[PDB]
Amino acid sequence: VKHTAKAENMIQLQFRMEQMVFCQDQIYSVVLKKVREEIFN
Amino acid sequence: VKHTAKAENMIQLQFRMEQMVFCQDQIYSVVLKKVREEIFN
Numbered sequence: 001v002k003h004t005a006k007a008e009n010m011i012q013l014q015f016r017m018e019q020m021v022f023c024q025d026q027i028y029s030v031v032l033k034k035v036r037e038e039i040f041n
Numbered sequence: 042v043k044h045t046a047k048a049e050n051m052i053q054l055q056f057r058m059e060q061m062v063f064c065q066d067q068i069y070s071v072v073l074k075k076v077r078e079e080i081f082n
Contacts, residue, residue, distance in 0.1 A: 035080060
């Protein structure tokens with residue numbers, strides 16, 4: 001039970017960090033795919 | 042002097058308008074200009 005309640009709480013905690021939407025300084029990798037896949041190619 | 046005075050106010054005024062940025066559907070072809078100089082050219 002104890003370990004179960006911890007995993008469950010950890011999962012919700014981890015989705016609360018993704019919603020605040022940190023726009024990272026390495027998105028570039030996938031920025032680049034805009035001007036490759038979607039326009040030039 | 043009448044028409045010097047008239048001319049200058051209008052020339053001042055037009056620059057008063059430009060501060061207020063806008064442009065409707067003309068801006069489309071100058072994005073294509075971006076498209077040509079950033080990618081293909």
